[PDB]
Amino acid sequence: MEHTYQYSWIIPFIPLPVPILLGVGLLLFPTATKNLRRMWTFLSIFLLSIVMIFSIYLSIQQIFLSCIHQNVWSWTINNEFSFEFGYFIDPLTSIMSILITTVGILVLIYSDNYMSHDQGYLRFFAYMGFFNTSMLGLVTSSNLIQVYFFWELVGMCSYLLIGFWFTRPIAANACQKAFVTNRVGDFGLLLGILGLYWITGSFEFQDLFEIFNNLILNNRVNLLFLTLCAFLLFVGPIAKSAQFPLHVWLPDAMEGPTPISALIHAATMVAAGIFLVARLLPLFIVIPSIMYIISLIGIITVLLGATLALAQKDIKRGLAYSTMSQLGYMMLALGMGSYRSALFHLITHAYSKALLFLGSGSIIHSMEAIVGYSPDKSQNMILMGGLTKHVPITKTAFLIGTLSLCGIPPLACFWSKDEILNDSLLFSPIFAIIACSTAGLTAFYMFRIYLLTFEGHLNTYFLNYSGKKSGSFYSLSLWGKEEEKKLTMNNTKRASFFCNKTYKISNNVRNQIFITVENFGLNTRTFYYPHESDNTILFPMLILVLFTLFIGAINQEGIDFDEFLRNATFSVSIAFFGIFIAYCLYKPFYSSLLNLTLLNSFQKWNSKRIHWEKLINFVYNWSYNRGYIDSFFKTSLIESIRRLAKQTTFFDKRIIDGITNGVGITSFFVGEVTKYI
Amino acid sequence: SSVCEPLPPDRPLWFPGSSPPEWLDGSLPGDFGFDPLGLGSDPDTLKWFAQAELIHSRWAMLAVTGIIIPECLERLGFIENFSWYDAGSREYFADSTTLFVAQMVLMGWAEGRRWADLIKPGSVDIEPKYPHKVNPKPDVGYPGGLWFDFMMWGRGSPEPVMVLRTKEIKNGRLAMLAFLGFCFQATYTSQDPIENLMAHLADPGHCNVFSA
Amino acid sequence: AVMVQQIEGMRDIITEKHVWHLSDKAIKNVYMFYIMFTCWGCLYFGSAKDPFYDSEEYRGDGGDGTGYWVYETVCISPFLILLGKKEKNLEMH
Amino acid sequence: GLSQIEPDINEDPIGQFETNSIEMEDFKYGYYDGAHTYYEGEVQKGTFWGAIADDIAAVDQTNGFQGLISCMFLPAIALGMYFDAPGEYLFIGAALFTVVFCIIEMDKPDQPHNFEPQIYKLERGARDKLINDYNTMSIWDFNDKYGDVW
Amino acid sequence: DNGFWIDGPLPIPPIYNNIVNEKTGTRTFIKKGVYVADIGTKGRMYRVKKNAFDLLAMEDLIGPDTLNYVKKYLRLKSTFLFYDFDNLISAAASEDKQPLTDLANRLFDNFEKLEDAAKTKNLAETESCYKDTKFLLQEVMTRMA
Ligand code: CLA
Ligand SMILES: CC(/C=C/C=C(C)/C=C/[C@@]12O[C@]1(C)C[C@@H](O)CC2(C)C)=C\C=C\C=C(C)\C=C\C=C(C)\C=C\[C@@]12O[C@]1(C)C[C@@H](O)CC2(C)C
């Protein structure tokens, strides 16, 4: 305590110098620093390991000693600013610091091989290290000034990571939409911290906590100003944690890397909003209506995040909407006032879905050998099919992750969601059974994802489907030296060479002579099956498996750090109901464990597809059109600004530049007239 | 890409202008021909001595780290009363004799697996198999593996494998000598290594070994 | 520098408050060295092999250094080919 | 560009806001964005000092003396503080540095990229301002094409 | 006085019959325009503690060629202390009123002498006044805590 918090200012700045050296290396001497290709990787990993060990040491001192350190320095001293940039060590700082550092180290170990076949390598690790710098500075922040500072820097790093692969234009639309949405949240954080400075005059996390115990009891401040100030202060976490108004940036983040899917969300950056709301809960329990607003936004986005992940063709977008629905669970917990269970659910999701993203990217890099390089091919969860037979450790890691979200008590994570629903049902009956219903839906789509990825035949090398596969397996025909010397140019064999005559019909033969000329055999015959990725992909997945097994059982440390059977079996029953409904739909007949009489009766009861033909249509159109909110925002929010921009440059160039140009036009005209008069 | 190419005959030697012995052609990393006595004559025993050097150097490197880094933390104000040559006499749990036998059990497992690697290379194989995936056969002392090469730096990713193994061996020979300096100058000065460094850097002339 | 803060809500706070400011003279000093860096960089990087504004891509086509050399080029070289076409018709092509 | 002939008008002005990039149907992934290029084994060493000096030697017009004074100029100010506090001596030294740099930058090569685009016709090497002081070769009037072939 | 943008003189807030001024003039560290918030009497009591700790932990700022930032930091934090003591004595309990306003007077004359010491760029008088102003800042913090 005596000498370890005075050097707590380094944990933002320790990742920083390798993006500083890359930002002056790639920008000045690109052959030199790209010749030092893998060394900056290990240097970023080592500096983040230093920050990991120091954050673990601060966490050990937080669980031993109950104290908070606020090691503030001075930044500007001219007038009423007197600004500080200090570092606020609460238990939330320890949770967020280990949550950044462990996930960042594992994503960097992953990204050594994810980017190992990328021409863009070092600028990705510059963005990674500068993002880790910015987010660790965000969580070690003693005032809203520095929260605002590193908040916008995190938004910039999100822009850079999503538009990392800058040559593809869908990532360009993605990163523009992402940074603009983060700036719509930044907007609210601005006029929210300025509203708090007008209500308090604080600009510090220290004095807000001892002013908001009696600020609402005053007559000068308005309750309306406090609730609109707190709502605008919540607009920021809406944009970071991808809540219902500002959610349209999250599923477009897929076009960048898969490590940024593991780090922009299921990690640090969507935990920025959770960190902010949980840090400001001593001034969110005081303002009465904002708690209901946070509960309302969470309970609106949990039905949106659930129904979106039901019918995604993309693996990464589906896990993104799963991340958004779990972030809605976190905001629903933050709307409970639950100071403890919200952060614990944050920890277990941020170690669970990070593992799920690394498993998804291992699936993707295994599929790259099959389909070549394409996100509509190598990220399409439909034609993944089954990979249990091929990549087993990826299967085990992805399965432990999806059971960590499905809520399995012994060997996965369930106690978090148990505390969520336990704190939910004694609060308001409207919010509770729909939360359990979304939990059942969450188990449903996560098991749907697991079955479409790992369980069944491959859907791409399947001999019913691929014609090049049937041409490649059968190097010789079924007769050997008969029926052909091989036959190419197989003609229009409608009659099947049976000399079949025709009754009264429209036509049998015509002037149409079209031969189905098929492709050949014995050429690129191999079609190498998706083998396992190297050690740098499995090793973060093994460590995150050890996390999600270790955190999933956490006389407890629930109070010193910061209906028992019926509710638990109800949550497990509705989750296993989602398991069962996904299992009977996607798990094929040759590998399912169910009795074939019941399995036959599933299609026998439902062979009509008329009362299913509207339900599947509505759910798929919802998940495909993004609840039509993407189309409405691209119709009347950004194209409305485009029409406003064209109208405003019309008013500029035509009828205020028109007046100024018309002064000279009139002087020319009166000069030409009075010359000739 | 991953072949462990040796050093050329016209390599830098420990003693320039001297003839390197015929049993140090350059197959091993850090081969500079150091053999005034010639203890590595028998190549079947020079393999064991190369493994000996490698493990000795790795332990010395971890040890010099565990001596100097925690002393830097003590100077920074993290650890109390740190002194590595009195850090075995000080108090823990388990009496330092139960710790010793538990250490001997666990390190017996580990070093026994390593011994079984040394006697017969493929006996204790790790990095489990995968369909249509051929894990490369490693060398003794450099197992590769998911546990010891998770960044895949051993097969020659950032740099060639020979220069990386030479980096390991040279950095580790330097660490072996650093630990000998620790074991000697912590008993002929009865003081701290970093303290001895700052004391010599104060006055390099008169604060040397001849003062004591 | 040690202040123990008593807030009833969460916990006690051990704020440090190292109030500091770069000395008045040091702001002049960092200005002095940055004007020195500006001087050095202007001289040295003006004395550099400037790879774009040397080649026949820039200096060859037009390249007077303005922003209209493209426009006077594509506005005068068609007049150049019209002049060459008239001088071609002057000898009956 | 050059456009000796008049260019084809874009019949499809793709959009006032969206880019001029190809769509996802024609975008080959990996080989366009570089995300799946860099198969190593074809790259070279020169690690971080065989490629800094390669780059400094690639773009430089400086001799031995000028350039040594340029490399020692900024440490002469970094030792202007932390070693002394001389005052005006740094500014007078940098002023004389710039004066002697400008006198050194009256170089003997004159490098016809330093000349007008009206100079570029042909045989401009036979033009020698590099040696001929007070040239008096009245060609810079630029109004009629002069044959300066003498 | 048309709601938005009161206009003309742009006044500073007055003193509610308190003897908290110099009496040969009002006060010489009055920053002209700062936003002290109408929080409440416990809020002003806490912000006295906060800015008194700020001027307490002004240690690492004081030094040669730094006296102007010392003067600006003093004027800022002491203007905060001035309006907060004005609200505290303006909402005092009629027996805590007189000793706390005498404490504020003997604190503010000390601030005047320290501001004049840092205004004339004299470091010895700055430190010789900063000693007992550190005493009085510890005194006012342990009063407000
Ligand atoms: C555990 C110790 C150890 C061992 C087993 C080896 C083993 C080897 N070294 Mg390495 N080496 C070491 C430590 C060690 N080295 C250290 C600390 C240095 C730096 C000083 C070097 C520097 C070095 C170079 C530069 C080269 C080698 C080479 C070799 C090979 C041939 C020599 C041989 O067989 O010696 C076997 C050695 C022993 C069995 C240990 C000696 C034990 C006896 C009892 C003497 C110990 C007392 C010692 C002199 C005390 C030091 C006093 C102090 C004042 C300095 C072999 C693989 C050559 C090679 O091909 O590299 C691969 C080569 O060119 N070594
Ligand atoms: C393995 C090793 C060190 C291991 C250290 C460990 C585990 C340390 C543990 C601890 O410190 C910590 C971490 C923390 C403390 O709290 C506790 C202890 C327990 C104290 C050192 C080897 C140190 C090894 C040394 C010094 C070996 C030197 C060998 C030399 C010089 C050989 C020379 C020659 O053999 C050649 C090469 C060739 C021949 O031809 C010629 C000659 C000349 C014969």
Q: Sign of torsion, CA A548 A552 A557 A562?
A: positive
Q: E93-121 as b/e, with b when 16 or more CB fall inside 10 Å?
A: eeeeeeebbebbbebbebbbbbbbbbbee
Q: Which chains touch E (3 or more CB pairs under 8 A)?
A: A, C
Option in B77, B132, B146 nearest A3 (CB): B77
Rounded to whole angstroms, the Cα distance separating A289 from A270 reads: 24
**Does the CA dihedral B104-B109-B114-B116 come out positive or negative?**
positive
Residue nearest to atom 28 of ligand 1 (CA): B34
User: What is the widest separation between alpha-carbon atoms in chain A?
Assistant: 106
Residue E63 corresponds to which amino acid? G
d(CA A91, CA C26): 38
The reply, when asked if residue B168 is annotated as ligand binding, is: yes
Q: What is the Cα A195 distance to its own chain's centre?
A: 31
Q: The tokens of D46 are what? A: 């020169």
C–D contact: 3+ Cβ pairs < 8 A: yes
State the Cα–Cα distance between residues A218 and A32, nearest whole angstrom: 63
The answer to the question of whether B200 is labelled as a binding residue is yes
D38, D43, D52: residue with CB nearest A32: D52
Residue B40 Cβ < 6 Å to ligand 1: yes
Contacts of D68-77 with CB under 8 Å at 24 or more apart are D69/D97, D69/D100, D69/D101, D70/C40, D70/C43, D70/C44, D70/D101, D73/C36, D73/C40, D73/D97, D74/C36, D74/C37, D74/C40, D77/C32, D77/C33, D77/C36
Q: Whose CA is nearest to atom 61 of ligand 1?
A: B31
Going by C-alpha positions, the residue among A304, A293, A358 that lies closest to residue A326 is A304
Closest CA–CA distance from residue A254 to any residue of chain D (Å):
14
- Sequence-distant (6+) residues with CB within 8 A of A575 are A406, A407, A408, A439, A440, A442, A443
Q: Do chains C and E touch (3 or more CB pairs under 8 A)?
A: yes
Is B22 part of any known ligand binding site?
no
Residue A490 three-state SS: strand
Tell me the CA distances in angstroms from A435 to A416, A422, E105, one per residue in order. 14, 11, 61
Rg (CA), chain C: 33
- Residue recorded with tokens 């332990």: B59
Residue type, D145: K
Ligand lying nearest the CA atom of residue B51: 1
Half-sphere exposure of B142 (CA within 13 A, CB side): 24
With an 8 Å Cβ cutoff, are A72 and C7 in contact? Answer: no
Q: Is B53 annotated as a binding residue?
A: yes
Is A104:C50 a contact under the CB 8 Å cutoff?
Answer: no
Q: Beta-carbon neighbour count of residue A566 at 10 Å?
A: 8
B133 φ/ψ angles, rounded to the nearest 5 degrees: -135, 120
Beta-carbon contacts of residue A79 (< 8 Å; ≥ 6 apart): E31, E34, E72, E76
DSSP letter (8 states) at residue A314: B
The first and second tokens of residue D99, run together, are: 């004066």
Phi/psi region, residue A480 (left: phi>0; alpha: psi -120 to 50; beta: rest), is left
For residues E88 and A199, what is the distance between their CA atoms, to the nearest angstrom?
A: 19
Best CA proximity match to E118, nearest among E57, E56, E75, E54: E75
CB A211 within 8 A of CB E46: yes
Chain A environment of E50 (Cβ under 8 Å): 206-207
Ligand 1 center to residue D67 CA distance, Å? 47
Return all residues near A72 (Cβ < 8 A) that are at least 6 apart. A84, A85, A86, A87, A142, A143, A204, C15, C16, C17, C18
Q: Whose CA is nearest to atom 6 of ligand 1?
A: B53
Ligand 1 atom at minimum distance from B169 CA = 62
Method: cryo-EM
**What is the least distance, in Å, from the CA of A548 to any CA of chain C?**
29
Contact present, B96 and B208 (Cβ < 8 Å): no
**∠ CA(A531), CA(A537), CA(A540), 5° rounding?**
140
Q: What is the resolution of this structure in A?
A: 3.9
Q: Is B171 annotated as a binding residue?
A: yes
A385 SS3 class: coil
Q: How many residues does chain C have?
A: 93
How many angstroms separate the alpha carbon of residue B185 from the centre of ligand 2? Answer: 14
SS3 (DSSP) at D18: coil
Which chain A residues touch C5 with a CB distance below 8 Å? Answer: 70, 206, 210
Give the burial class of E24: count Cβ atoms within 10 A of its Cβ; 0-12 exposed, 13-18 middle, 19 or more buried. exposed
Taking the alpha carbons of D7, D12, D16, D20 in that order, is the dihedral positive or negative? Answer: negative
The residues, ordered by sequence, that sit 6+ positions from C56 with a Cβ below 8 Å of its Cβ are none
Find the CB nearest D55 among A29, A376, A646.
Answer: A29
Residue A87 DSSP symbol: E
Residues in chain A that come right before a backbone break, where C and next N are over 2.5 Å apart: 486, 554, 562
Q: C41 — contact with chain D (CB < 8 Å)?
A: no
From residue A614, how far is each of A300, A586, A611, A620, A624 by CA, in Å? 23, 19, 6, 10, 15
Give me ligand 2 centre to Cα A114, in Å. Answer: 39
Structure tokens of C87? 């001088």
Query: Which of B14, B39, B53 has most ligand 2 atoms within 8 Å of its beta carbon, as the pocket-test mutant?
Result: B39
Would you state the structure tokens that stand for residue E127, as one six-digit string?
């430190």
Between A35, A167, A169, which is nearest D48 by CB? A35
How is chain A split among helix, strand and coil, in percent rounded to 5?
A: 65, 0, 35
* Residues E39 and E95: beta-carbon distance below 8 Å: no
| Alpha helix ranges (H) inside A455-594 | 467-473, 535-550, 565-586
Q: Do E34 and A79 touch (CB under 8 A)?
A: yes
Query: Taking the CA of residue C86 as centre, how many other CA atoms within 13 Å lie in the half-sphere pointing to its CB?
Result: 5
Contact status, residue B24 vs residue B31, Cβ threshold 8 Å: yes
Q: What residue's CA is closest to ligand 1, atom 21?
A: B173
Cβ E35 vs Cβ A80: under 8 Å: yes
Q: How far is the CA of B54 from the centre of ligand 2 (A)?
A: 11
Return the H-helix or E-strand segment holding C46: helix C24-46
Whole-number Å distance, alpha carbon B173 to ligand 1 midpoint, is 8
Chains meeting B at 3+ CB pairs closer than 8 A?
A
Q: Does C1 touch chain E (CB under 8 A)?
A: yes
Give the chain E residue whose CA is nearest to the CA of C20. E61
**Coil, strand, or helix at residue B195?**
helix
